[PDB]
């Protein structure tokens, strides 16, 4: 099997559909990655994650590098063996959550209550046995002045080069894994261009659009994607970090994005929000107490084949673990079915119509 | 399929092994019943409960009669349909937990902050669609004076007759379900005898030993079982309510018990205690942080086929739902494997040796 091979099978406008072949499996694009926090996709066995259609998961690095620790996970055989997921894992750099969850910044890296640098991040992801490694970057806060956005983006580009060099120095990592760079530049077109130029000069297997989904709102996010994604190499995957709601995903695919990760389906699941083709519902609402219909009328997932809204309503109101399990499996399956419909409609040259039909019904 | 047919295939001393055939399935005895609280075996899908080997589950009635309510569950198609378990369900009467979790007692029944009577209990269990219905009784507190134990037991016997009559008056229930009576009498042999006599005079499909596992300790529980179980009809199942730890179960089978229920494997599971053939372990203990062995070296369950102690240690310490899921599935599977070994050893006339071997290793 190849280390990393991206093939585009079909296009419609800026939207693409295709495959990434890697040693541990094939990734169908556009792809949604369920998020594994602390080496688990919350409330799901890996076999259930796979049953929903997921080809790849995102492994958060931040918690794992603290406990059990990256060296310990490597001693235990790597993250794949540890958690029982044998397909590709994309690991984040650890830095985003350092800024969010724990700090002193410098050119070397970030110190926090430990020092995380581009080199240490790459080594940690190596020890975990990551298939897709993210360059260590800085997510510029929103809003930012042009000067602050510029200095931040430039530091990220220097860190991108350091990430590239550290990755390339580790033969086994370079042979078996892939490395993605992350574009910054806030909402500023000229800075996004400078960032894309820098990343392309270094060269990566894929390119993420960073610095978005940080409070700017969908209109602004879409505006920035409009000019930012075409700046990236067309022949490599485009990854939008931390996105998003179903409508965010459809619009981002319309703008050339191939990969997504988001905690929404899992987090929402546990909190009682189920995604349906007619929009989200809160299953705790009294209107579902005697509703024998499945969560969604069309959904192919095992939860909708077997249990009613009324039962899941009861479980979530009772605080039962099975409620979290069933809601999460359905929500992840819904996201995967959304990605499948996106892939099929692009392949068939009817994605524009699908996007329109999806929105009309989802927001009715 | 028959409504209720108990067949004893083999005996060794007071121990029996056999089958109960019912309309929704066969129950292999001695049997362990996982407990479903609020219409779920906590942290397990019904398919997983079945995969562990369970033939029947216990449905607590107390919470369900409050929310969603018995009438509501009946409107939704009954408990089996509601929770997705299509095999036999034994329901308790609701009264034990009324005394434990919420009271004014009278000859009519128990009032609590609702009135629960033998007639109302039987009707609630009917509405849930129970396969094995428990007579409504009073669990005498321990310790009790002989006079208090006597008056309590006598009230329970009057309630047993009322339970019998209410059950028999409902044609569909009498045709499709079974009814068990519950022996009381505290630790007093003469009262246990009077209770057994009363229950046999009324006639039930099975007989529970009530009033035990309420603080008396194993030595005393075994002493009471020694004389109490032979008082019950030999040709019907014997059910020990709320028992217990693995060694409690082995000793109770040695004394003629055929059926068990206990929250221990599920509750312990969530709290980090795993049962093994070498005794219980607390998976949170630091000694398991790098232990790549399964929870138990011989266990056939899916958890022990795939995940390490180290991973489950990590999950439970992180408060992850998957930790509760995996611990619970293993513990229920362990209990079922214990029951299978008990059944096989009685069938083969080597149960005495099994009990000795089990204890020597479990308590080493
Ligand atoms: O620029 C980034 N570099 C590295 N990692 C990132 C992660 C991100 N995550 C988000 N947004 C997360 C949005 N999410 C929505 C659901 C609720 C929790 C927050 N933007 C990001 C940008 C970056
Ligand atoms: O005499 C009884 N009548 C009706 N229901 C019962 C339920 C019982 N449950 C117990 N003991 C429960 C022990 N269990 C052990 C694990 C932790 C929670 C308590 N004795 C019981 C007697 C009775
Ligand atoms: Cl997110
Ligand atoms: Cl119990
Ligand atoms: Zn579904
Ligand atoms: Zn096991």
UniProtKB/Swiss-Prot annotation, chains A, B:
It is an enzyme of class 2 (transferase). Its EC number is 2.4.2.29. Belongs to the queuine tRNA-ribosyltransferase family. NCBIfam families: Q_tRNA_tgt, tgt_general. Catalyzes the base-exchange of a guanine (G) residue with the queuine precursor 7-aminomethyl-7-deazaguanine (PreQ1) at position 34 (anticodon wobble position) in tRNAs with GU(N) anticodons (tRNA-Asp, -Asn, -His and -Tyr). Catalysis occurs through a double-displacement mechanism. The nucleophile active site attacks the C1' of nucleotide 34 to detach the guanine base from the RNA, forming a covalent enzyme-RNA intermediate. The proton acceptor active site deprotonates the incoming PreQ1, allowing a nucleophilic attack on the C1' of the ribose to form the product. PANTHER family: QUEUINE TRNA-RIBOSYLTRANSFERASE (PTHR46499:SF1). This is Queuine tRNA-ribosyltransferase. It comes from Zymomonas mobilis subsp. mobilis (strain ATCC 31821 / ZM4 / CP4).
